[PDB]
């Protein structure tokens, strides 16, 4: 870690706020350094080529350390703060600002650091701490791993470094392109029907394993031969429809206890071409309210840039027959 | 007159073995001036029944209204704490550690919460819990409000309230034994008196006006006599308990007004005599919608772990160290 990270952390301390090295058991030979810009999220490919070009500075001929951006774990927070009407001078809009700062001040200080961790109980005491009028808060978290490629998990897998619950793992939705014509003079003569779809996990087996299955289809546009046939279990979360779509299929699988997640859309004869996205986001409920980082993973609150991962509900109180 | 004037009156003539006073008057009970009194040490003033609450009676000035020196209507917090710490950061035992967090959970209560018209917040106390070591990483909790009920048979004339809002089905008591008149045998033993099963009081989802039933069960088909009035509660709509004895027929005996925050029941509404029940006092648990629990009139949120240990479970969890290498 610090053996080489620190140096770098000297010649570049004006940008990078977090640097640590690690190996991949598997990508033998390769040493990577994750670095987080103090100034946001991803170092720029120019900022990256400069930093790599101090590798020559310190003479090493062997292929030498790949710099790269950190594997972020995000907390989708659903915050609720109840406050006293009397004791609150400015706008609700102000108050939010006042606390959404506190959250960040906790993250920067105690969390946004390698192998340091997020404790929901701590940041709530930060929230409480934001005004002299913030009587008490509560909070509900999710974990977000932002997936680089939707089509197949890495060679190795995707892991949260944390225990999730059953059926918990679920990506967002991405358009699948069937291939049929719609024949609609509204928008010409042909739209190419494309219905949303997601990738969810099902319940632990006898032995700790689930199945990573993929959202609703219309019989025809997925070819089934004995082997590859519709999944049947109802041990997962189906999604809102308006269409006659209820045929989910099975790729990869979740090892709940070892938290590893592998899937590969290929397991059903569907080329990347068929989906109009390239990136997705995987969510899942933690088991605990204390969540952890490990090799090159970093937990981070970047809220003016990932605002989708915080929501604040306030509850103004006076006196009082009622706060819900 | 004036409750405030009275509160003082006692924060003087007794201001010795008394910590706090709430002089409130109940709108259901005219001409009666009620005086809540915290013992400053324990829970009940003359649990010996007056020894004390009679001495204060013996203080008279003016008015046609009469004092009724009572002990405070206590709100309890059944906390299921789940603190987690770092194996290495810890030098003394889990045993010494518990005795360290509850030292804080107490510090919070007795400074901010254990007061009249004062309140409790889970988030705020879990800050105090977290603040007991160099680690101690974080903490979880799962709380319920508890109201201790003397005479399980029936609530007061005017119902019992929490001074807080609870959730649908949230309200449920601990279990108690109901002596069915009947008799059975096993294991070579004999009649074994009268068959007993564990029975209890639960609330149902609120109807379209904010109002569910307060029901009691299960039973046998059974040990309760059904009338035009007395009939098994009609439908699923709440929390049933383990029929390790197979039973299930519950009966309506009151209702919760969720908005008004009032709960009334009377076991006499079916026809069971208190004789058919082992108990006298029971516990009434509900879980709030409140991220803040409010005390109020004669109500008081207190934390007495020593004398009320049952209302706190701490499950610790040790954690492996991270990087020790550099």
UniProtKB/Swiss-Prot annotation, chain A:
Q: What induces it?
A: Expressed in the late phase of the viral replicative cycle.
Superkingdom is Viruses
Q: Where are the transmembrane segments?
A: none
Localization, per the record, is: Virion
* Record's function text: Baseplate protein that is located next to the tail tube (inner baseplate). Involved in the tail assembly. The gp25-(gp6)2-gp7 module is involved in sheath contraction.
* Homology family: Belongs to the T4likevirus baseplate wedge protein gp6 family.
Oligomeric state and interaction partners are given as: Homodimer; each gp6 molecule in the ring interacts with its two neighbors, forming an N-terminal dimer with one and a C-terminal dimer with the other. Heterotrimer with gp7; gp6 is part of a (gp6)2-gp7 heterotrimeric molecule. The (gp6)2-gp7 heterotrimeric molecule further interacts with gp25 and gp53; the gp25-(gp6)2-gp7 module is involved in sheath contraction.
The protein depicted here goes by the name: Baseplate wedge protein gp6
**Gene name on record?**
6
* Coverage span on the entire protein: 342 to 660 of 660
């Amino acid at each position: 870690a610090t053996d080489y990270d620190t140096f770098v952390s000297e010649r570049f301390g004006s940008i990078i706020q977090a640097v640590q090295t690690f190996t991949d058991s598997t990508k033998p030979g390769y040493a990577f350094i994750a670095a987080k810009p103090k100034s946001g999220l991803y170092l720029t490919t120019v900022q990256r080529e400069d930093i790599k070009n101090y590798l020559k500075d310190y003479n090493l001929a062997p292929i030498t350390p790949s710099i790269i951006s950190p594997n972020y774990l995000f907390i989708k927070t659903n915050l609720k703060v109840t406050y006293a009407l009397n004791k609150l001078q400015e706008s609700e809009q102000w108050l939010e600002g006042q606390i959404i700062d506190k959250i960040d001040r906790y993250y920067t200080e105690d969390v946004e650091i390698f192998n340091s961790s997020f404790a929901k109980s701590k940041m709530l005491t930060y929230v409480d701490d934001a005004d002299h009028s913030v009587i008490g808060s509560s909070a509900t978290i999710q974990m977000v791993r932002e997936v680089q490629n939707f089509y197949k998990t890495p060679e190795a897998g995707i892991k949260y470094n944390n225990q999730i619950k059953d059926r918990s793992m679920e990506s967002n939705t991405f358009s699948f392109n069937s291939g049929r014509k719609v024949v609609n003079p509204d928008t010409g003569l042909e739209e190419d029907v494309l219905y949303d779809v997601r990738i969810v996990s099902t319940d632990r087996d006898s032995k700790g394993i689930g199945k990573v299955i993929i959202g609703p289809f219309a019989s025809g546009d997925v070819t089934e031969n004995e082997n590859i046939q519709p999944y049947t279990g109802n041990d997962f979360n189906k999604l809102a429809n308006s269409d006659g779509r209820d045929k989910y299929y099975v790729i990869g699988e979740i090892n709940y206890p070892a938290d590893v997640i592998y899937w590969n859309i290929a397991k059903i004869n569907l080329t990347s071409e068929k989906f109009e996205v390239q990136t997705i986001e995987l969510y899942s409920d933690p088991t605990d309210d204390v969540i952890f980082t490990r090799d090159g993973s970093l937990i981070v609150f970047e809220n003016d840039l990932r605002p989708q991962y915080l929501t604040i509900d306030l509850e103004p109180i006076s006196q009082l027959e009622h706060h819900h």
